[PDB]
Amino acid sequence: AEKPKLHYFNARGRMESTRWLLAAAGVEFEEKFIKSAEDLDKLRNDGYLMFQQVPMVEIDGMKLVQTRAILNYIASKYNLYGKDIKERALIDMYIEGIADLGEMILLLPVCPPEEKDAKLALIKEKIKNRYFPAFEKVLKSHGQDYLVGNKLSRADIHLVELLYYVEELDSSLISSFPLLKALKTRISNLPTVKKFLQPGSPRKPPMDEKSLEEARKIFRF
Ligand SMILES: N[C@@H](CCC(=O)N[C@@H](CS)C(=O)NCC(=O)O)C(=O)O
């Protein structure tokens, strides 16, 4: 059958959570890297990008854009979206909080230098006093290895991805949250996730100066 194909540039950006979810599901996929503004303009002009943006993923005969549309489809297709409407409500609540915090961190490299220190201080406050307490409370309420329904869901994958990024910012932020530490360890030892964390996978590194320079050239900003 059709192997999913991911269109993005060679960076984490807004495509990385899709790489994580597919890899955790054990799904082999291909990447086609946008390398220039001209490559992106070609995808646009040829009609493959509904809103003239990437990420775009070719899957099951669709040319899907919008990261949440992509992720919702992949999660349902591979049984990572709970078992019923009520479990989906819990999953959706959890992953939208993860997305809110993830978006703050995603945009740090494009923060104006005079605002960066204060932006980071606000993110750390929210991590320590709002988001990490909320997810620690979920894990403590039921004591299970997984956030919802006692089985792996996209919520476990998205949260553990975020925990790795929080660790890159400040490895002390998770220190008072032992259940989050334990989730990070367990999920990382799942065979599919372990393979994704090992070298040679589609997992991408933190954006550096040269990668930011490429992004400015490709996306003209
Ligand atoms: N809400 C969209 C945002 C997509 C988006 O902002 N993509 C950027 C790259 S990360 C882009 O293609 N920007 C070019 C532009 O908007 O013209 C999503 O979640 O996919």
Q: Which domains does the chain have, with CATH numbers?
A: 1-80+190-221 (3.40.30.10), 81-189 (1.20.1050.10)
Between CA 90 and CA 88 the distance in angstroms is 5
Kindly state if the Cβ of 52 falls inside 6 Å of ligand 1.
Answer: yes
Between CA 181 and CA 160 the distance in angstroms is 9
The radius of gyration of the chain's CA atoms, rounded to the nearest angstrom, is 18
- Residue 205 has what DSSP assignment? P
Measuring CA to CA, which residue among 169, 156, 173 is closest to residue 91?
Answer: 156
Question: If you search the block for the tokens 């002390």, which residue do you land on?
Answer: 172
Helix, strand, coil content of the chain in percent (nearest 5): 60, 5, 35
Q: Sign of dihedral through CA atoms 183, 201, 106, 73? A: negative
Measuring CA to CA, which residue among 97, 63, 216 is closest to residue 55?
Answer: 63
Kindly state if the Cβ of 17 falls inside 6 Å of ligand 1.
Answer: no
Q: Which helix (H) or strand (E) holds 154?
A: helix 154-169
Between CA 88 and CA 79 the distance in angstroms is 11
Kindly state if the Cβ of 165 falls inside 6 Å of ligand 1.
Answer: no
Give ∠ CA 24-25-29 in degrees, rounded to 5. 90
Ligand 1, from 54, 70, 105, 108: best to mutate by most atoms within 8 Å of Cβ? 54
Would you call 11 exposed, middle or buried from its count of C-beta atoms within 10 A (0-12, 13-18, 19+)? buried
Q: Could you tell me which residues come within 8 angstroms of residue 61 by beta carbon, excluding any fewer than 6 positions away?
A: 2
Kindly state if the Cβ of 216 falls inside 6 Å of ligand 1.
Answer: no
CA of 66, closest atom in ligand 1: 20
Measuring CA to CA, which residue among 59, 6, 22 is closest to residue 193?
Answer: 22
Q: Show binding-site residues for glutathione.
A: 8, 44, 53-54, 66-67
**CA 119 / ligand 1 centre spacing (Å):** 22
Would you call 199 exposed, middle or buried from its count of C-beta atoms within 10 A (0-12, 13-18, 19+)? exposed
φ/ψ of 101, rounded to 5, equals -70, -40
* Structure solved via: X-ray
